Amino acid sequence: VFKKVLLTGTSEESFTAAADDAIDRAEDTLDNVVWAEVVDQGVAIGAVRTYQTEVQVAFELD
Amino acid sequence: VFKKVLLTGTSEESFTAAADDAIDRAEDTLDNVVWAEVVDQGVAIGAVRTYQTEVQVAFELD
Amino acid sequence: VFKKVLLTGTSEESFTAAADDAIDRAEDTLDNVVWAEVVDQGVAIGAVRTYQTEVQVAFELD
Amino acid sequence: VFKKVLLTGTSEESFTAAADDAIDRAEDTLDNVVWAEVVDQGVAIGAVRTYQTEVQVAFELD
Amino acid sequence: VFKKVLLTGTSEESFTAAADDAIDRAEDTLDNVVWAEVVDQGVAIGAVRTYQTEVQVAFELD
Amino acid sequence: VFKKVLLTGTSEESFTAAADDAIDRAEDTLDNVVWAEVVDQGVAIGAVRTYQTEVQVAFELD
Amino acid sequence: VFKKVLLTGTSEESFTAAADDAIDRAEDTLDNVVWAEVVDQGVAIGAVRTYQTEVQVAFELD
Amino acid sequence: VFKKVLLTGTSEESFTAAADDAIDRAEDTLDNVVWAEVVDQGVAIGAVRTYQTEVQVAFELD
Amino acid sequence: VFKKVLLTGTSEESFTAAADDAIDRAEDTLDNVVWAEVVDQGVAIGAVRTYQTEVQVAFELD
Amino acid sequence: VFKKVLLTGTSEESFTAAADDAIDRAEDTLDNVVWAEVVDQGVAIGAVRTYQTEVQVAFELD
Amino acid sequence: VFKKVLLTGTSEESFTAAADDAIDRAEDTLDNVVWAEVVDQGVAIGAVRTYQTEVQVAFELD
Amino acid sequence: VFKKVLLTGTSEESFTAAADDAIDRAEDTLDNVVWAEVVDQGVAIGAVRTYQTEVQVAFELD
Numbered sequence: 001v002f003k004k005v006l007l008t009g010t011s012e013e014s015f016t017a018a019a020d021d022a023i024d025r026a027e028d029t030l031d032n033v034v035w036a037e038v039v040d041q042g043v044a045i046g047a048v049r050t051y052q053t054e055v056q057v058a059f060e061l062d
Numbered sequence: 063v064f065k066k067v068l069l070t071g072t073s074e075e076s077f078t079a080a081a082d083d084a085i086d087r088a089e090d091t092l093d094n095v096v097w098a099e100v101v102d103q104g105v106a107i108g109a110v111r112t113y114q115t116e117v118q119v120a121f122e123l124d
Numbered sequence: 125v126f127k128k129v130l131l132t133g134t135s136e137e138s139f140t141a142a143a144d145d146a147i148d149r150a151e152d153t154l155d156n157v158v159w160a161e162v163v164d165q166g167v168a169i170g171a172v173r174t175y176q177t178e179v180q181v182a183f184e185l186d
Numbered sequence: 187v188f189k190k191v192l193l194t195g196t197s198e199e200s201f202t203a204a205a206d207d208a209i210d211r212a213e214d215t216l217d218n219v220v221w222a223e224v225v226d227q228g229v230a231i232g233a234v235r236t237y238q239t240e241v242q243v244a245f246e247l248d
Numbered sequence: 249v250f251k252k253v254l255l256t257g258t259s260e261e262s263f264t265a266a267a268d269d270a271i272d273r274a275e276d277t278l279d280n281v282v283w284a285e286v287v288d289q290g291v292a293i294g295a296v297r298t299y300q301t302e303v304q305v306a307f308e309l310d
Numbered sequence: 311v312f313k314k315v316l317l318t319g320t321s322e323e324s325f326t327a328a329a330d331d332a333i334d335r336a337e338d339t340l341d342n343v344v345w346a347e348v349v350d351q352g353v354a355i356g357a358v359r360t361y362q363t364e365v366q367v368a369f370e371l372d
Numbered sequence: 373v374f375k376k377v378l379l380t381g382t383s384e385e386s387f388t389a390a391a392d393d394a395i396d397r398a399e400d401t402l403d404n405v406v407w408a409e410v411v412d413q414g415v416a417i418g419a420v421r422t423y424q425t426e427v428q429v430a431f432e433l434d
Numbered sequence: 435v436f437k438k439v440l441l442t443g444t445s446e447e448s449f450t451a452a453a454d455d456a457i458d459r460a461e462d463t464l465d466n467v468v469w470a471e472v473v474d475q476g477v478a479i480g481a482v483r484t485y486q487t488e489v490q491v492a493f494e495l496d
Numbered sequence: 497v498f499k500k501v502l503l504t505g506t507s508e509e510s511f512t513a514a515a516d517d518a519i520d521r522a523e524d525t526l527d528n529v530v531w532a533e534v535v536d537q538g539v540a541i542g543a544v545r546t547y548q549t550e551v552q553v554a555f556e557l558d
Numbered sequence: 559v560f561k562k563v564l565l566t567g568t569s570e571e572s573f574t575a576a577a578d579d580a581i582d583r584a585e586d587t588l589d590n591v592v593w594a595e596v597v598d599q600g601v602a603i604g605a606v607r608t609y610q611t612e613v614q615v616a617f618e619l620d
Numbered sequence: 621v622f623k624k625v626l627l628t629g630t631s632e633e634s635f636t637a638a639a640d641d642a643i644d645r646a647e648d649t650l651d652n653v654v655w656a657e658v659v660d661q662g663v664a665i666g667a668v669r670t671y672q673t674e675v676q677v678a679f680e681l682d
Numbered sequence: 683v684f685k686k687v688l689l690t691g692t693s694e695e696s697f698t699a700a701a702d703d704a705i706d707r708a709e710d711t712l713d714n715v716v717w718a719e720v721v722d723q724g725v726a727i728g729a730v731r732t733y734q735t736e737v738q739v740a741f742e743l744d
């Protein structure tokens with residue numbers, strides 16, 4: 001059985017790096033992280049632009 | 063990084079109050095709740111009508 | 125077996141009241157109405173504003 | 187011909203009031219506003235909760 | 249309040265059995281599991297075919 | 311001209327059998343039933359699991 | 373309150389004529405038909421091509 | 435950079451002519467109109483039927 | 497077994513004629529073409545307008 | 559690089575068997591078939607019922 | 621109240637840079653640009669490849 | 683007439699590079715490749731992360 005958590009990563013560099021940011025966090029807390037599916041992307045436009053990528057991160061249970 | 067949980071709130075009053083019910087629960091257990099996105103709405107039609115609003119509730123990790 | 129009818133309720137007060145308007149009509153004509161799922165919402169903007177909520181209203185057959 | 191603008195209204199009271207907030211703004215600047223279609227709803231969760239409703243607001247050209 | 253977890257069950261037999269696999273896991277760890285909504289289905293095609301069914305599994309909080 | 315009715319069939323066995331349950335009901339009351347399109351699937355999780363499959367069932371008018 | 377029926381019209385001429393075919397049928401049986409929304413279009417490719425347009429046809433109840 | 439405006443054209447003749455009606459209006463007011471994407475179609479059913487086609491009309495900025 | 501190819505037909509006349517253009521091409525190269533489903537429509541706006549209709553064209557294998 | 563073909567399998571038994579029918583055909587003609595994603599399901603309702611499952615079948619190129 | 625404009629940015633480098641191109645244009649003409657949501661991505665494949673990213677760019681009114 | 687093939691490109695660097703990988707393959711085998719539309723993005727999370735971008739790649743027939 002796989003479980004997915006819905007995480008939004010952030011980066012001041014790119015959408016790819018923002019996806020990586022979410023995956024990094026998943027891997028810090030979860031075992032057996034296997035894949036991620038991009039579900040949304042955006043940009044927070046402030047003093048700087050922060051790229052965001054929302055991902056379902058799938059991990060194998062047990 | 064943000065994480066979202068998928069909660070369905072309920073109210074005998076309104077769709078807004080049902081969204082609030084879910085957010086109330088999120089805030090009881092989670093720190094740094096920042097926003098909610100409505101993803102579904104409905105009504106359980108019994109002795110009384112119960113309005114339901116399903117929300118992704120986003121919170122900041124750490 | 126459940127059957128759904130696609131009804132648009134109207135209210136000069138709120139989206140919740142507009143959903144109720146549709147459900148009210150369903151319950152006037154149908155037996156065993158059990159739930160409603162919101163599928164669209166809008167506002168007719170005239171002399172007054174009329175809130176509309178479109179619902180699939182599910183009822184149990186037999 | 188109709189044209190639509192994509193507006194997000196806000197209210198500390200309800201999703202209906204947030205839709206109204208967007209429509210109010212449309213009517214301040216545009217002639218012949220005829221209808222609005224809800225396209226998203228959410229809640230900014232801060233010191234207070236701010237309900238938001240995003241609407242396509244349609245107006246007749248000329 | 250209901251909460252949903254997003255689980256992908258697997259079976260070498262059928263899409264129904266794969267949905268059951270996810271629900272089985274939910275019921276092992278969670279109290280008050282009430283329903284599941286199918287959100288995706290697929291097949292891993294290897295030495296054998298493994299049917300997968302992704303479900304939102306809803307449970308009542310408290 | 312074809313008309314569709316939106317029916318949710320149920321089965322304690324499978325998603326296919328649940329689709330059949332809806333079609334069975336359609337054929338009991340309607341003439342010239344020609345096809346069904348699956349639009350949703352789920353499982354009611356109680357004393358037993360009840361698989362549900364929602365179908366648009368198309369029939370030829372006249 | 374409005375109600376919608378889901379009809380597929382057919383024409384050997386055009387998608388517009390196929391929409392009209394569905395509306396024609398609605399108006400033959402129903403009072404207060406007010407609008408139709410196109411939800412699908414296709415073509416049956418046989419001895420001749422038959423254009424099909426599926427519409428939700430809305431009518432005012434009472 | 436391209437910008438899109440969301441216009442609903444109308445015609446008593448056809449969905450194609452309704453798309454053209456929107457594009458005609460775009461070209462009256464905007465420079466460098468390049469393409470249109472159909473996003474919705476419907477029919478206002480009154481004394482006469484009025485076909486409507488909603489289009490995103492894209493134009494090149496500058 | 498059916499297979500679908502994703503084709504975009506073009507016409508300077510209408511969306512229906514553009515669908516036909518795609519189907520014409522399918523029938524030139526493929527045996528047992530049975531149906532087409534419209535998946536997108538648009539207009540290339542140049543010296544002339546070119547209507548486009550994208551279709552999944554289904555054909556029976558073998 | 560992966561490529562997907564869009565196939566509709568058929569079975570007089572089940573949606574799972576219909577998915578298998580499509581995959582069987584893919585594997586007869588293609589090398590390195592790796593997965594399938596269900597994209598639609600339905601039932602042809604004639605002398606017998608024929609379950610259909612449409613799948614994107616992914617295979618590795620080279 | 622927020623308003624969104626639908627812009628397609630372009631870059632010969634990346635999807636992120638294409639999103640930035642749209643945002644750059646928004647900020648040249650509009651005050652109080654706050655966020656952007658990615659709604660489509662593609663690539664024009666000519667003498668060179670031009671990455672495109674379509675964004676809803678939100679700005680605060682007044 | 684345009685035809686689209688559904689390809690998933692891969693890269694250990696970025697989503698843009700993964701889109702390019704698919705387009706590269708298309709251009710190796712097909713004439714008159716004109717555009718690509720991104721339809722999905724994800725990441726295979728193993729010894730290394732492999733970014734994937736699924737694209738419809740459109741080419742002109744003849």
Ligand SMILES: Cc1cc2nc3c(=O)[nH]c(=O)nc-3n(CCNC(=O)OC[C@H]3O[C@@H](n4cnc5c(=O)[nH]c(N)nc54)C[C@@H]3O)c2cc1C
Nearest residue numbers: 041042043044045046047052228230652654655656657680
């Ligand atoms: C993908 C995406 C979707 C969103 N959706 C919403 C929304 O639906 N409603 C909303 O209020 N804010 C959103 N936001 C806004 C979160 N805020 C944000 O991005 O702010 C960027 C900068 O602008 C400043 N800022 C925040 N709120 C406001 C504001 O209301 N007005 C102005 N002028 N500036 C503002 C603070 C930051 O330096 C979204 C941000 C992203 C990246």
Ligand SMILES: Cc1cc2nc3c(=O)[nH]c(=O)nc-3n(CCNC(=O)OC[C@H]3O[C@@H](n4cnc5c(=O)[nH]c(N)nc54)C[C@@H]3O)c2cc1C
Nearest residue numbers: 103104105106107108109114156158159160161184352354
């Ligand atoms: C948004 C939404 C989606 C749903 N979707 C489903 C579904 O897909 N399948 C399903 O079985 N029940 C659903 N439900 C039903 C959950 N039950 C429910 O709302 O019941 C309302 C009242 O009706 C009674 N009830 C429950 N099940 C039945 C039933 O089967 N028949 C009758 N006559 N009444 C029933 C108990 C409550 O007093 C949904 C409820 C809501 C609010």
Ligand SMILES: Cc1cc2nc3c(=O)[nH]c(=O)nc-3n(CCNC(=O)OC[C@H]3O[C@@H](n4cnc5c(=O)[nH]c(N)nc54)C[C@@H]3O)c2cc1C
Nearest residue numbers: 165166167168169170171176218220221222223246476478
């Ligand atoms: C959710 C939603 C979707 C819609 N979609 C369409 C549409 O696609 N095409 C369309 O013609 N009208 C629509 N309508 C319009 C139905 N008419 C409507 O709301 O009118 C409100 C007031 O404006 C007046 N009105 C109606 N049509 C016209 C018009 O064409 N121009 C002007 N200036 N006003 C008009 C009569 C009412 O007092 C929609 C209304 C709602 C609430």
Ligand SMILES: Cc1cc2nc3c(=O)[nH]c(=O)nc-3n(CCNC(=O)OC[C@H]3O[C@@H](n4cnc5c(=O)[nH]c(N)nc54)C[C@@H]3O)c2cc1C
Nearest residue numbers: 042044094096097098099122227228229230231232233238
């Ligand atoms: C519908 C909707 C979609 C959104 N989507 C995004 C998004 O995609 N990315 C994003 O960064 N912020 C969003 N936002 C956030 C806009 N900010 C926001 O709602 O903040 C509410 C309160 O929380 C505070 N806040 C803002 N950003 C943060 C934050 O990052 N962490 C914490 N702890 N608090 C924060 C300021 C306000 O008092 C969305 C808000 C709404 C209402």
Ligand SMILES: Cc1cc2nc3c(=O)[nH]c(=O)nc-3n(CCNC(=O)OC[C@H]3O[C@@H](n4cnc5c(=O)[nH]c(N)nc54)C[C@@H]3O)c2cc1C
Nearest residue numbers: 289290291292293294295300590592593594595618724726
């Ligand atoms: C619903 C669904 C969506 C997917 N989506 C992706 C995807 O987007 N990207 C991806 O790389 N793999 C996917 N997969 C692939 C997961 N792998 C998988 O199913 O492998 C089946 C058998 O094929 C073998 N395999 C795995 N990767 C490859 C591969 O790259 N090439 C070949 N020839 N075989 C492979 C191992 C297994 O025995 C998906 C599997 C399923 C069931």
Ligand SMILES: Cc1cc2nc3c(=O)[nH]c(=O)nc-3n(CCNC(=O)OC[C@H]3O[C@@H](n4cnc5c(=O)[nH]c(N)nc54)C[C@@H]3O)c2cc1C
Nearest residue numbers: 104106280282283284285308351352353354355356357362
């Ligand atoms: C596809 C699908 C969508 C749904 N969506 C909703 C919904 O949106 N809101 C809702 O209240 N119930 C739903 N339901 C719930 C209908 N009820 C249901 O499935 O109950 C299964 C068993 O659990 C018991 N049950 C019902 N409601 C409750 C509950 O609230 N808590 C607990 N612990 N158990 C409950 C009675 C049955 O023996 C859905 C059921 C299905 C199959």
Ligand SMILES: Cc1cc2nc3c(=O)[nH]c(=O)nc-3n(CCNC(=O)OC[C@H]3O[C@@H](n4cnc5c(=O)[nH]c(N)nc54)C[C@@H]3O)c2cc1C
Nearest residue numbers: 413414415416417418419424528530531532533556600602
């Ligand atoms: C929009 C749309 C969606 C569809 N979806 C399906 C589907 O999902 N499954 C399916 O079996 N048939 C479909 N059909 C097929 C309905 N049949 C049909 O269009 O047939 C056209 C001509 O081809 C002949 N035909 C029917 N079935 C067959 C077949 O299986 N093979 C061949 N070679 N020809 C056939 C009879 C007619 O003269 C669809 C038709 C349309 C117009």
Ligand SMILES: Cc1cc2nc3c(=O)[nH]c(=O)nc-3n(CCNC(=O)OC[C@H]3O[C@@H](n4cnc5c(=O)[nH]c(N)nc54)C[C@@H]3O)c2cc1C
Nearest residue numbers: 166168404406407408409432475476477478479480481486
């Ligand atoms: C695509 C589309 C979506 C829509 N969606 C809505 C909606 O969501 N809510 C709504 O109130 N009206 C709509 N409309 C209605 C706009 N009105 C409309 O089409 O009216 C046609 C004729 O019927 C008459 N009409 C208008 N409103 C009524 C009405 O309420 N009842 C009756 N019997 N007739 C009416 C005036 C015109 O001669 C839509 C029209 C179109 C073409």
Ligand SMILES: Cc1cc2nc3c(=O)[nH]c(=O)nc-3n(CCNC(=O)OC[C@H]3O[C@@H](n4cnc5c(=O)[nH]c(N)nc54)C[C@@H]3O)c2cc1C
Nearest residue numbers: 466468469470471494537538539540541542543548662664
């Ligand atoms: C449904 C649809 C979706 C599209 N999507 C895109 C897109 O996402 N990105 C893009 O660059 N072009 C598109 N196109 C543009 C393809 N080009 C096109 O339609 O051009 C029409 C006339 O305008 C001229 N043209 C082409 N590119 C340009 C341009 O960039 N600027 C100007 N002023 N004119 C142009 C040549 C033709 O005579 C789309 C065309 C259609 C019909």
Ligand SMILES: Cc1cc2nc3c(=O)[nH]c(=O)nc-3n(CCNC(=O)OC[C@H]3O[C@@H](n4cnc5c(=O)[nH]c(N)nc54)C[C@@H]3O)c2cc1C
Nearest residue numbers: 342344345346347370414416599600601602603604605610
């Ligand atoms: C998922 C799905 C989507 C479809 N969509 C369409 C459609 O959009 N338009 C259409 O014409 N037929 C469809 N079809 C119809 C393909 N035909 C079909 O299923 O026929 C079943 C039995 O009924 C008989 N049949 C075929 N067409 C007719 C018909 O028009 N009327 C009657 N009474 N029976 C008919 C022959 C078979 O024994 C679809 C079939 C399936 C399984």
Ligand SMILES: Cc1cc2nc3c(=O)[nH]c(=O)nc-3n(CCNC(=O)OC[C@H]3O[C@@H](n4cnc5c(=O)[nH]c(N)nc54)C[C@@H]3O)c2cc1C
Nearest residue numbers: 538540661662663664665666667672714716717718719742
């Ligand atoms: C996301 C996206 C969606 C689109 N959708 C459409 C469409 O729906 N219909 C369409 O005609 N063109 C599109 N386009 C095409 C816009 N044209 C384009 O990208 O052209 C790229 C290069 O190919 C050349 N080119 C343009 N049109 C044609 C063509 O018809 N054939 C050939 N062989 N080459 C062509 C000129 C450029 O150097 C789309 C481009 C993008 C980036």
Ligand SMILES: Cc1cc2nc3c(=O)[nH]c(=O)nc-3n(CCNC(=O)OC[C@H]3O[C@@H](n4cnc5c(=O)[nH]c(N)nc54)C[C@@H]3O)c2cc1C
Nearest residue numbers: 032034035036037060290292723724725726727728729734
């Ligand atoms: C976008 C996308 C969608 C997918 N969807 C599915 C799916 O629906 N079902 C599925 O089984 N695998 C998928 N996959 C999985 C394909 N496998 C994959 O990415 O594996 C990455 C690394 O993890 C290892 N791995 C593969 N399967 C398993 C596994 O089951 N458990 C563990 N712990 N590790 C695994 C091999 C690779 O080094 C998807 C991969 C991508 C990139």
Ligand SMILES: [Cl-]
Nearest residue numbers: 006068118254
């Ligand atoms: Cl989720």
Ligand SMILES: [Cl-]
Nearest residue numbers: 192242440626
């Ligand atoms: Cl828009």
Ligand SMILES: [Cl-]
Nearest residue numbers: 130316366378
């Ligand atoms: Cl319906």
Ligand SMILES: [Cl-]
Nearest residue numbers: 502564688738
């Ligand atoms: Cl496809």
